[PDB]
């Protein structure tokens, strides 16, 4: 964190919150790990040090310029925005695992408690702005710079990590991206409606596909919007979707070739590739291994 954000570029107040981030997340982590315990059900709940890795991975992907630009674009102090970023990234690692809505509300408390005590200087300005009800979400694709007149003629949108204030402003962008996806993939139509929770999930999936060396595991009862949102996120992400084709002839050998073509796309030539798996696509347990 000290190497990635330097003292020179940032204001004296902003860099006091940067130093606090590293001390903060640990205070939160300890409170979260001591209250949410692993059990037969909710077995994943257990928090490791990968979950501390991943929190930061989120914070360090959000660029220096975007934090200094916060007073212009987000109409808030840069020091405040930075805690806004932290809160989101802590949430996306710790809150997203949690299975029921009651266990989320408990953790949202521990994010708020900590924030207020770690960032004492901007406590009164944090407290009024940041709640579990109000939405301060982050994405890479926010920028509408992709006009898409006869394909992508006007360069591409710089994939920068920004904040969005309202879901309604987000919905217009995401709705346009969905309608465009149906135009580009005309064989496989994806009729879908993006409600408040569905938008959040799409950001959550588009975050996991974006970060380097990160895989996503989406757990839902089925028809919960898992597949549909993944193909959208992938399309918005401008990365290739690979889906296992299940036929009786197809076996463990053909999977290995389908994975091999994945590495042939990814490791070789340098294409971002998102391999997609469902319960349906796992014919046997050996494929999943």
């Amino acid at each position: 964190i000290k190497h990635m954000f330097k003292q020179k570029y940032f204001s004296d107040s902003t860099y006091k919150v940067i130093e606090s981030l590293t001390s903060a997340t640990i205070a939160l982590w300890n409170k979260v790990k001591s209250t949410m315990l692993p059990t037969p059900a909710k077995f994943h709940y257990v928090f490791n040090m990968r979950e501390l890795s991943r929190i930061f991975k989120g914070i360090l992907t959000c660029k220096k310029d975007t934090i200094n630009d916060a007073p212009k674009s987000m109409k808030i102090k840069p020091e405040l925005f930075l805690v806004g970023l932290w809160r989101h990234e802590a949430e996306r690692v710790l809150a997203d695992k949690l299975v029921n809505n009651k266990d989320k509300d408990t953790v949202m408390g521990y994010i708020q408690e900590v924030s207020l005590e770690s960032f004492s200087q901007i406590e009164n300005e944090i407290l009024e702005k940041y709640s579990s009800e109000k939405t301060f979400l982050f994405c890479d694709f926010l920028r509408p710079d992709v006009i898409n007149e006869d394909g992508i003629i006007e360069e591409e949108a710089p994939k920068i990590y920004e904040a969005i204030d309202s879901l309604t402003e987000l919905r217009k962008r995401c709705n346009f991206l969905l309608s465009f996806y149906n135009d580009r993939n005309p064989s496989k139509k994806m009729p879908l409606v993006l409600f408040d929770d569905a938008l959040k999930h799409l950001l959550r999936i588009s975050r996991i596909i974006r970060q380097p060396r990160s895989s996503g595991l989406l757990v839902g009862v089925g028809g919960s919007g898992k597949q549909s949102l993944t193909r959208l996120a992938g399309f918005i992400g401008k990365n290739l979707i690979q889906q296992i084709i299940v036929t009786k002839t197809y076996s463990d050998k053909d999977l290995k070739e389908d994975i091999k073509k994945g590495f042939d796309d990814a490791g070789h030539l340098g294409k971002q590739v998102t391999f997609l798996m469902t319960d349906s696509e796992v014919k046997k347990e050996e494929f999943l291994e």
Binding site: V221, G222, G223, V246, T247, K248, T249, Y250, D279, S280
Partner: protein
């Protein structure tokens, strides 16, 4: 002519107002009932009443959705004749089983039956007797060549196969059929099953009979197929037995109503012809209304038919109070039985 025209005009205006009110009531009723069809199936008799008559009806009145206050489900969705038919098929007379029946006909999703004793199965066997064949239409979930012998043949032909001994867990190869996802080439409607495309006719039907008292079904399964609790219950049997006691005891009274109701439904249809006949013929006639005797006759004739219908419908309503008093008195027999 003035008196006849005034009466006819008043009846037509009342009918038009009733029709507009009925359309609003029908939208509310469909919202109350479709909810019943899709969701209430897997619940017992008590919980269907709780889930529809206590929850949804309360929700409607608060929201201000226009709905008919009584909205008897059985009456709205299906005709009284077709209920009569399901009784002959073997569908019991009790209130639950009628609804179970209704759900099978009206559901887009393939029905699934919970019945431990094939009462729901023995109804679906006696019905669809033309489309069902005894040999190579009924198989168990697990057969050596389930797919290629039974399933494949039944989709190709369009014959109604009935899955036997589902035993909670369903096979994943069947999933694409339950989904009704179809890759259409012309009108063949080829459906892939474990990778292999199979010609599905529109007339093909699937029925899935669970033979367990409490099966634990997966959400994916419960979403794919409408689940119907066909289980015989004490409160259910009571209403069958009460039906059988009323058919035996005070038979003459109950029969006279069943005769009257059948003759009333005729007289409604009969009146629908005469007032139609007038409309067709009052346009065709045109000028000199005062000397048009062949038309004039039916305008006076319609009023006698209308007056007759109106008198029977009052008497019908009286006989439904009569038989219901006897339904309360003979309740203790059934419930004991």
């Amino acid at each position: 002519l003035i008196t006849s025209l005034s009466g006819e005009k008043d009846r037509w205006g009342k009918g038009a107002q009733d029709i507009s009110d009925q359309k609003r009531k029908l939208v509310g009723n469909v919202s109350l009932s479709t909810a019943f069809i899709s969701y209430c199936g897997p619940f017992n008799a008590e919980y269907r009443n709780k889930l529809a008559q206590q929850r949804f009806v309360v929700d409607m009145k608060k929201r201000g959705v226009p709905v008919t206050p009584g909205l008897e489900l059985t009456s709205f969705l299906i005709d009284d004749a077709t209920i009569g038919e399901w009784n002959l098929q073997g569908l019991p007379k009790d209130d639950l089983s009628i609804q179970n029946g209704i759900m099978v006909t009206n559901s887009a999703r393939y029905p699934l039956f919970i019945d431990p004793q094939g009462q729901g199965q023995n109804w679906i066997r006696n019905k669809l007797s033309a489309s069902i064949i005894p040999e190579r239409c009924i198989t168990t979930l697990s057969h050596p060549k389930f797919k290629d012998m039974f399933l494949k043949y039944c989709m190709e032909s369009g014959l109604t196969l009935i899955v036997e001994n589902i035993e909670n867990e369903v096979d994943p190869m069947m999933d694409p059929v339950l989904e009704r996802q179809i890759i259409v080439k012309g009108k063949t409607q080829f459906v892939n099953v474990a990778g292999t495309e199979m010609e599905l006719s529109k007339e093909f039907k699937l029925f899935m009979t669970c033979r367990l008292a409490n099966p634990s079904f997966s959400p994916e399964l419960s979403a794919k197929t409408t689940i119907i609790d066909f289980t015989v219950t004490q409160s259910g049997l009571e209403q069958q037995l009460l039906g059988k006691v009323i058919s035996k005891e005070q038979k003459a009274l109950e029969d006279s109503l069943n005769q009257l109701l059948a003759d009333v439904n005729q007289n409604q249809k009969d009146l629908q012809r005469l007032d139609k006949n007038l409309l067709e013929r009052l346009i065709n006639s045109q000028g000199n209304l005062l000397d048009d005797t062949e038309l004039m006759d039916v305008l006076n004739n319609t009023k006698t038919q209308a007056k007759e219908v109106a008198a029977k419908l009052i008497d019908a309503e009286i006989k439904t109070k009569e038989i219901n008093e006897k339904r309360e008195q003979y309740r203790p027999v059934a419930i004991r039985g």
